[PDB]
Amino acid sequence: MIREERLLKVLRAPHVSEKASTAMEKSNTIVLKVAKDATKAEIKAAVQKLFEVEVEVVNTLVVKGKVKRHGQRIGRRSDWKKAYVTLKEGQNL
Template identity: 60%
Template sequence: MSTLKFDEGRLMQVLVQPIVSEKATAVAEKHNQVLFKVLRDATKPEIKAAVELMFKVEVDAVQVVNQKGKVKRFGRTIGRRDNVKKAYVSLKEGQELNFSGEAA
């Protein structure tokens, strides 16, 4: 594992939350990938190390998407949602990730 060069406290904060949606479920089934919302300054090696540390799985690759926040109106005022960074984490063949906390 490549967690030696990263601070473990930082790795625990990199993954903000898993993304559970219809699109995420379809991607998970088709490409064996899992989606996470991550910190905006997180790097691909950090994301890989964090997933391997927290879920005890082997990660094959990581792709990231920077999603711009939508402009929304609240009555008269115009606001903006925060920008979000998403990580598409590809797991190695035969690896499975479950969020229930039990060992597979």
């Protein structure tokens, strides 16, 4: 049991890409941007509660932010956590 207030903060956005699209069509895996301090257990709990789908497993990685220049002034985008959430077979988001 994680508190719902916590679960309502952990999922930030669906990650849109060719790889994410292929993940959903081939492997029944949604790709999410999640809070940087989100654990696999919290992401699982949140997806099952909020999307109302059975989660099989969560795989996670931290995307390191890119160094970029805006008018010859150097900056760095933020690191963010990606979750590959594999839904149980036949759940279908």
